[model samples]
Target: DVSGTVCLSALPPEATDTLNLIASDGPFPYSQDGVVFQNRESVLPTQSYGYYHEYTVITPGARTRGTRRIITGEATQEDYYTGDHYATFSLIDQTC
Candidate 1:
């Protein structure tokens, strides 16, 4: 349903864990984790204002939440993960 692939096995273990939490309507690790993703870069396909939301991907030993994030859409299981502060993204399949 999108234009990219990120092997789940290649991601940090914490990323998969965050994806699971997103599925359950999480007790997210950071206050900003579930905030709306502006998609300001237009890297992802466009959608409704509330359709996209973001969750943090904890980077091991980082003092801050870091640049990593998992962005999910309300309409489908399809989602995306970004490690470069939304400069780029990769589609996430149903493997969570």
Candidate 2:
């Protein structure tokens, strides 16, 4: 299936928090927060290599990065939330 759309309010709490941090230009929880997100899955809109950056959506009781992440594009205020490790994504509707 193709990617869909999601409002910010519809996202998990952790995902919301991650977005907030991104808004503030974060002092992110993980060192990988600002790292380039290689869109190998081709689920998101195609963009240049450095145009997208990723931030982890902290998961409870997990010893690792978990399955959620917020991938953002630089050209505009584009944010995509993926809860399944890039298997799918929903463009975050900031208006909500």
Candidate 3:
């Protein structure tokens, strides 16, 4: 139940020369059933580039009785600056 699409576009010039996108998935705060799918470096001089990343994960058969959540983190670093980071989470209900 861990799947989605990520898109990045129209970034600032000085934000970061290169950006890294990382993602993770899980059933909750007590499981290590997560993963990092995308880890690419930007090539554009400015941050005004577009990225369309997609991923899909199949859930374990034993974990089909509760809710599942997917957490994602985007890490960006520039050659001229420190770094910038962002994170988000989504949920999927599988109760029938």
lDDT (0 to 1) per candidate: 0.80, 0.85, 0.25
For 1-75, candidate 1 gives per-residue lDDT tens digits of 244878766778888899889878888877677888877767788877877888888888999888888888887
Using lDDT as the yardstick, the better of models 1 and 3 is 1
Clashes of each: 0, 0, 0
**How well does candidate 1 match the true structure in TM-score terms?**
0.87
Which candidate's TM-score is highest?
2
Query: Best candidate, lDDT-wise?
Result: 2
Judged by whole-model lDDT over C-alpha atoms, candidate 2 comes out at 0.85
How big is the RMSD of model 3?
15.8
lDDT of 3 by residue, 1-96 (tens): 112222223223212112221222223333333343242443212222232222222224535423222222332311121112213222222121
Question: In terms of TM-score, which candidate is stronger, 2 or 3?
Answer: 2
Candidate 1 pairs with clashing backbones: none
Clashing pairs in 3: none
As for TM-score, the candidate ahead, 1 or 3, is 1
